[PDB]
Design a protein around this ligand. Structure first.
Ligand SMILES: Cc1cc2nc3c(=O)[nH]c(=O)nc-3n(C[C@H](O)[C@H](O)[C@H](O)COP(=O)(O)O)c2cc1C
Length: 367
C-alpha cells in the first residue's frame, strides 16, 4: 500500500517500465519557430530515468495545427531530424518516450495560422470571451470565429495525424499519444457543448466519436496499436469544452477504443485521462474508476496528483500509471523525490510559456 507501489514494475505493452511515475505532456514554448531546440534535449534528459516513461509537450501535425507560440512540430524533415537528437539523449538514459500529436482546432488565432487564415473546427462557434489566447508577445488576445470543416477535410486532418505518427517513429520515438483532450480539435468533435453538427460527425454519441475513432485507427494502422496512447478529458470544461453527460461520453469513447483493439488484434499502449479537481472529488474519482474499469488496457490517471494520491491510485487499482505535470516542471528528479519522499520544489507559473532555453526551464535544481 505505502511500501510504494509507484515503484513496482509495469509492462506497458512491449515497454517494460521500472516505475509508474510518468512525465505528463506539457507545452513549454521553447521550440523556437516550431523546431525542437537543444534546450528540449536538456529538459527531457534531466527528467528521464532508467525505465521511466516520458510524454512530450504537444507537437504540431500540420502548419494549421498550432495555437501557442514556439510549440514543436513533427510534420517536416527538419523537425524530425531535430527531434531525433532529443530522443537519442533520452534513450541514452534508458527512458521510454512518446510524442504527443496535438491539433488545437478553434483554440488558435490568425497570428498562429499560415496567411492569417481562420482556425478550423467542427463548428463555426468561437470559444467565448471568458477565455483568452496567449499571444507571441506575452499578452493575451481573442479567439476568432473558426471555420467548420467538411468531411473531405476531416479525412485530410486524419492523414496529417497518420503522417505525423510515421514521422515520430522515424525520429526514434517509442510511440505517440493522441491529444483528444482539453477542448482542442478532437474534443471539439467529442463535446456536445461544441459539436453542433448536423452531418455524420455530429448529434449522437456514435457520430461525435467518429473523428477520434478514425484518428486512432489511422495511427494504429500506421505504427501499431502497441505504440499509440490516447488521451481525453470528458469532464474538463476548458475552452468551453463541456458535455451534457461527461461520463456517458467517456464510456462511449472507451467503447470505440475497445473495438479498435479487438479488430486490430492488439492493445493500445494506454488510455490516459485528465481529472478536474468532498462531493465533487468523490464523484470525479467515481468517473475515473468507471472509465478505467471499462477500458480493456493500461490506464494512466492525471490531474492534481501528489505523491500520496499517486500511491493510493496504484495501490487501489484505480490506475496502472500516474502522470505528473506542474511538479515535474520544477522537480527534474521528481521520480527520485517521490521515491525518497524528499521535499518538492515550487514551480513558477510566470515562466511556463516563456522562450528562454534555461530560465524557468532547465534551471530548477535537483536534490
Ligand atoms: C504549463 C503546462 C502545459 C501543458 N501542456 C499540455 C499539453 O501540451 N498537452 C496535454 O495534453 N496536457 C497539457 N497540460 C496538462 C498536463 O498534461 C497535466 O494533465 C496536468 O499538468 C496535470 O496536473 P498536475 O499539474 O497537478 O500534475 C499542461 C499543463 C501545464 C501546467
Amino acid at each position: 500500500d505505502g511500501n510504494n507501489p509507484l515503484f513496482s514494475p509495469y509492462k506497458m505493452g512491449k515497454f517494460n517500465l521500472s516505475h509508474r511515475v510518468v512525465l505528463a505532456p506539457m507545452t513549454r514554448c521553447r521550440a523556437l519557430n516550431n523546431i525542437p531546440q537543444a534546450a528540449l534535449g536538456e529538459y527531457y534528459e534531466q527528467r528521464a530515468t532508467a525505465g521511466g516513461f516520458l510524454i512530450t509537450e504537444g507537437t504540431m501535425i500540420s502548419p494549421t495545427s498550432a495555437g501557442f507560440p514556439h510549440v514543436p512540430g513533427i510534420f517536416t524533415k527538419e523537425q524530425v531530424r531535430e527531434w531525433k537528437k532529443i530522443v537519442d539523449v533520452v534513450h541514452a538514459k534508458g527512458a521510454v518516450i512518446f510524442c504527443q500529436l496535438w491539433h488545437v482546432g478553434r483554440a488558435s488565432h490568425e497570428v498562429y495560422q499560415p496567411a492569417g487564415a481562420a482556425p478550423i473546427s467542427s463548428t463555426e462557434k468561437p470559444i467565448s470571451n471568458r477565455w483568452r489566447i496567449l499571444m507571441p508577445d506575452g499578452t493575451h488576445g481573442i479567439y476568432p470565429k473558426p471555420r467548420a470543416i467538411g468531411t473531405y477535410e476531416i479525412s485530410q486532418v486524419v492523414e496529417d495525424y497518420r503522417r505525423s505518427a510515421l514521422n515520430a517513429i522515424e525520429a526514434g520515438f517509442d510511440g505517440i499519444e493522441i491529444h483528444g483532450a482539453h477542448g482542442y480539435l478532437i474534443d471539439q468533435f467529442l463535446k456536445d457543448g461544441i459539436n453542433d453538427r448536423t452531418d455524420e460527425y455530429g448529434g449522437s454519441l456514435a457520430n461525435r466519436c467518429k473523428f477520434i475513432t478514425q484518428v486512432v485507427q489511422a495511427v494504429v494502422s500506421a505504427i501499431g496499436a502497441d505504440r499509440v496512447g490516447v488521451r481525453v478529458s470528458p469532464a474538463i470544461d476548458h475552452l468551453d469544452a463541456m458535455d451534457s453527460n461527461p461520463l456517458s461520453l467517456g464510456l462511449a469513447v472507451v467503447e470505440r477504443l475497445n473495438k479498435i483493439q479487438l479488430h486490430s488484434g492488439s492493445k493500445l499502449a494506454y488510455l490516459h485521462v485528465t481529472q478536474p479537481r468532498l462531493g465533487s472529488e468523490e464523484e470525479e474519482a467515481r468517473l475515473m474508476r468507471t472509465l478505467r474499469n471499462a477500458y480493456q488496457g493500461t490506464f494512466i490517471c492525471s490531474g492534481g496528483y501528489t505523491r500520496e494520491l499517486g500511491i493510493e491510485a496504484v495501490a487501489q487499482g484505480d490506475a496502472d500509471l500516474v502522470s505528473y505535470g506542474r511538479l515535474f516542471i520544477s522537480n527534474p528528479d521528481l521520480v527520485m523525490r517521490i521515491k525518497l519522499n524528499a521535499p518538492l520544489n515550487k514551480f513558477n507559473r510566470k515562466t511556463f510559456y516563456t522562450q528562454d532555453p534555461v530560465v524557468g526551464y532547465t534551471d530548477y535544481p535537483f536534490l
